[PDB]
Amino acid sequence: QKAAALVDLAEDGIGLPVEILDFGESARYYFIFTRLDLIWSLNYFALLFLNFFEQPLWCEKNPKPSCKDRDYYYLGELPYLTNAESIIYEVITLAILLVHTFFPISYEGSRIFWTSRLNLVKVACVVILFVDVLVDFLYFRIAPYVRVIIFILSIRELRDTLVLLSGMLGTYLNILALWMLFLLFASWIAFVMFEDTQQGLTVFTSYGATLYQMFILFTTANNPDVWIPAYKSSRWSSVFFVLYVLIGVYFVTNLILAVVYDSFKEQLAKQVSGMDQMKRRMLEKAFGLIDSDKNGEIDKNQCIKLFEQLTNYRTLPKISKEEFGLIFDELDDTRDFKINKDEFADLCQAIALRFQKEEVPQIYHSALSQQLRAFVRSPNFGYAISFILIINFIAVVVETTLDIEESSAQKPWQVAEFVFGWIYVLEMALKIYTYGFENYWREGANRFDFLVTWVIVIGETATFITPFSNGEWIRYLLLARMLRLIRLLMNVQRYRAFIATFITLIPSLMPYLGTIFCVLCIYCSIGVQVFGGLGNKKLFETELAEDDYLLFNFNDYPNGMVTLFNLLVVNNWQVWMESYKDLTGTWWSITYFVSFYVITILLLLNLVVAFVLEAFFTELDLEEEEK
Amino acid sequence: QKAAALVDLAEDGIGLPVEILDFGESARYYFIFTRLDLIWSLNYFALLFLNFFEQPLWCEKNPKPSCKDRDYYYLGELPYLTNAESIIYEVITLAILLVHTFFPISYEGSRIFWTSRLNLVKVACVVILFVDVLVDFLYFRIAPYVRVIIFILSIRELRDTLVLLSGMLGTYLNILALWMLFLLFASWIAFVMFEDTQQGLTVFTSYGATLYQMFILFTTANNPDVWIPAYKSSRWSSVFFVLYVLIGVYFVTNLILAVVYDSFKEQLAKQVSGMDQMKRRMLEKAFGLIDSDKNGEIDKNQCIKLFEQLTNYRTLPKISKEEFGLIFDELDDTRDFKINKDEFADLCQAIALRFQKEEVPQIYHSALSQQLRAFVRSPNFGYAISFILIINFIAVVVETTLDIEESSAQKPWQVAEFVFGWIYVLEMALKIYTYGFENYWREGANRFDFLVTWVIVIGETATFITPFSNGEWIRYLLLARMLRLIRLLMNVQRYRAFIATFITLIPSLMPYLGTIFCVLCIYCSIGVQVFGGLGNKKLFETELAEDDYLLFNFNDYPNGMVTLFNLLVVNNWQVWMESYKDLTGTWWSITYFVSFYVITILLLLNLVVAFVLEAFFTELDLEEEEK
Ligand SMILES: [Ba+2]
Ligand SMILES: [Ba+2]
Ligand SMILES: [Ba+2]
Ligand SMILES: [Ba+2]
Ligand SMILES: [Ba+2]
Ligand SMILES: [Ba+2]
Ligand SMILES: [Ba+2]
Ligand SMILES: [Ba+2]
Ligand SMILES: [Ba+2]
Ligand SMILES: [Ba+2]
Ligand SMILES: [Ba+2]
Ligand SMILES: [Ba+2]
Ligand SMILES: [Ba+2]
Ligand SMILES: [Ba+2]
Ligand SMILES: [Ba+2]
Ligand SMILES: [Ca+2]
Ligand SMILES: [Ca+2]
Ligand SMILES: [Ca+2]
Ligand SMILES: [Ca+2]
Ligand code: NA
């Protein structure tokens, strides 16, 4: 029915999904797009996850020519791949990819699909990846790059994050410029200051080297080491450097952060501005579908049925009656009952806030199940799982403390840990059964507990079909399933905002984190591509010592990934950068690390700082509002 | 006159000085307190600055017993002092101190002064310092501590900062507790994870050592080094540590910052709340002094004289007339003209914002000077000093570039640099003469340029009475006097907020910076007191190597000061902490460094972060308001 479809569009305004279609032809397109929305979700999340993982599992590129093949010399650690094996997965993921990327046409138009910049770029990368798999099939430099690109444009959350970044990138570049001025001036004045003195051994290459060292001091990664010769010369040399790390770290780095922060909050305000614009598009489509007379208002006899299927289909407001109309005219004192378009949306959002509790969506009998449903809905069940997890925790600390006491009662406790895993798979089956699959998926705690339970059960099939270190490690870890006991702390009035901010930050920071992860992966294929060596023997043991202890990496794609994590945490990065400089030979190999530090450290991480702060402030405001 | 005194109190409401006196007896007390306010300002800023500097120049304490006396063994660098010389300065500064600390009585009451907690603690430290100087005179553990304490309670700005810190300290302790929970849990799970594997060489002392290492990893100061054995064992060990530095650094450290931020803005809102309360106390004292009939309003014939001495004494509103009263009654259309107490303050603050331009406050003739005054007030003079500083800059880059080209035209340029110093002392004398001393002191640019000029002239007397490296260093540095050319950049619409935020941050961050500096000094007398050694020879060269290259310090009070700066910048701090641990011998010597890191790193520096951000946001808001 029209009114039914309208109520549906209203709960999609409240729940907030986004589609842009404008009709009996819009019904076939609606069936098509919803088809796409359900199955392609899991069967394609899997697909692009695995396809992106084909890049850290791919066969390296310097191993194709000389010399010795597959060794511990230049130190890798992951399984790699062959060409024959690589082609079959490149083809499979490329195929499911293709069918997805051309699917939208079925609910869009032909010239519409082919006029959308999104789909056009998606198919351009589709054909770059396809011609690649054809060449990697007959027998490579920009194959993984379309994997990470095609990944980042396959999840709307990372899409919109990248747009936000684009918006802040300009003013960000401005502050980067003023920053560059600071570094240049400080390098010139530092260098002209230590011109005819001992720190000619650290300002040897003069302004060229002193800008290098003043940059690495700007990141504080060499604070005591870099000016130790000058401190040895004079005591009062320090005055300079403490002046410079003072101004540069507490006066400069901070308001760079402030710049990225303000730019961020502005692009976010923009993003939710357009977001509310889309929700308005949907609710307005709806009321446009109830106002049959184009006058822009809806009747009593027309909104009693609309609120009727709202209260019947989505949420639990009240019941209509004869005092429904008598409360209508009694409330108005006028015999009109007409709601305009801009007040209807207000009604769907008042309903969206107060009345709204999205209800539960079999060829079976409730006969044998209606006891377990109503007794699992009892809070007694919640105290049951709570107490069960408590005793569980004591069990785990005893068993593990018996592998660290090395006594052998650890296995008698271990079997009980397995039977505890059984307890939890019971809780999962009875909970998913007694609430329904979608109502089970609606809460993040139950999503996580679900997938952790399923990792427990694949763990169980594996651990019992395969035959300790095969078991204790694969099962103690899921004590993270007791982590939900931390929600207890929110009952304390001191830590509510802390635990709450964190809890809501574990999802909301995930697109920004996945973004900086993809920047990592791109930089990783770059570094693998251009740093395949290790002059292995001499340039290595002369390059670094303890820093080659740290620098046995960057020659696999995983080694590159975790070395990029080390650069991410900033500690001792100039040994990776410095040693790869005196590995290649010229200075134009430092722009990898300066460019890295500047894209990820001054932009992305200042971004995540800003977002965490904004999340916690939001939290404090909500707690203020509840009272 | 009463009305005159009132207008005075109004401009002190606008300018915002603070006194709390409540009368012909309040006039003698007013003369007294103003006496104190002028001379004690310079002659006492000097005093407590020097007295505080008696602590880094004091004779050390482990040098009093054995063994070898005053050597390079255990490495100091500053002049020290003797007892005979120390006593005379302890006594002098203690004496001017005393006369100040008992001065307030003259404008306060006896039981009032002695009932104020401020003055009572001030005199308690007065007598602790005096009994000290008596003992240091006849022949020590808590002498410098009352120097830094007596310093921090001698400047209201640092006083109020410390109160703000007190206010945020509670909730700060709460987040510190939840943090401690994170570290403990992560240490237990990390340790039970690496229990029967190679990283028994890093989790040797078990939970005790693993909490140590997980703490130092929490500060990221050992990211690649600390888990390199486990990474050598398995590749998938990294997953743990990247998980942990992820959660701990981007999820935990950040919302700790957020906590200190919100607590800060709250205590600041409190502080300016009470501040406005004091300004209200002054303006209300004023209007209380004009409303002679206690009815709470002021007449026309009474506020025409009040606005009259406002416009005549402080600022430049308009002129009274017969159309002053005709504009009064013409504006009101009622023959009343009465202003209440709460609207009078509004009038003094509307005057304070729009009309307000505090005017210029000789037994001489303007005859010969009125040409230089009006031609220096011309902007042509501003373009004169601007161009002069530009050509000056080119001169300095040429001369200095000739000490780095080592050609000997550097001295011919150098004399011209001196004559440039002469140019600027001319600008200073003619500017201070043509604007007046107080109008010269009213702008921070002219305060700074004044004291830098005077350092140039003491430099000139010195450099010409003493006889290169005696000159080039002592004069090139004052090219910072051209630093004001950076104000030019504020004419660009991209960098206005940046340069402006910075410019206003060079003062506003100064009390928080001085605060963290005093925390440094206290920690410094602590460390000197308890770390006088260097088991010098063995425990040193076995303790540290490159880290003893860094650790030739902490055995003088300056060495302690700059080593505390190194700890402040956080880089490689665990070598100071670790080596001083295996110097003393037990683990109870790490609480110096954990306690340090926690008081200054998680509290004070998060504070200065928050304040910088708030300053820049304020700036953006003002630029928004001007349009
Ligand atoms: Ba020289
Ligand atoms: Ba030279
Ligand atoms: Ba070196
Ligand atoms: Ba109409
Ligand atoms: Ba619930
Ligand atoms: Ba609640
Ligand atoms: Ba080292
Ligand atoms: Ba074991
Ligand atoms: Ba063991
Ligand atoms: Ba070690
Ligand atoms: Ba930081
Ligand atoms: Ba009255
Ligand atoms: Ba001016
Ligand atoms: Ba202006
Ligand atoms: Ba850092
Ligand atoms: Ca390929
Ligand atoms: Ca209608
Ligand atoms: Ca003494
Ligand atoms: Ca009156
Ligand atoms: Na470091």
UniProtKB/Swiss-Prot annotation, chains A, B:
CDD domains cross-referenced by the UniProt entry: EFh
GO biological process annotation, one example: regulation of stomatal movement
Keyword set includes Isomerase: no
Known tissue expression: Ubiquitously expressed.
Record topological domains on the Cytoplasmic side: 108-124, 156-174, 260-377, 436-447, 491-501
Activity regulation (record text): Inhibited by Al(3+).
TM annotation in the entry: 38-58, 87-107, 125-139, 140-155, 175-195, 239-259, 378-398, 415-435, 448-467, 473-490, 502-522, 593-613
Intramembrane segments: 202-216, 557-571
UniProt function note: Functions as a voltage-gated inward-rectifying Ca(2+) channel (VDCC) across the vacuole membrane. Is one of the essential components of the slow vacuolar (SV) channel. Acts as the major ROS-responsive Ca(2+) channel and is the possible target of Al-dependent inhibition. Involved in the regulation of germination and stomatal movement.
Major localization class: membrane
Protein name: Two pore calcium channel protein 1
Gene Ontology annotations for the cellular component aspect, listed alphabetically: cytosol; Golgi apparatus; monoatomic ion channel complex; plant-type vacuole; plasma membrane; vacuolar membrane; vacuole
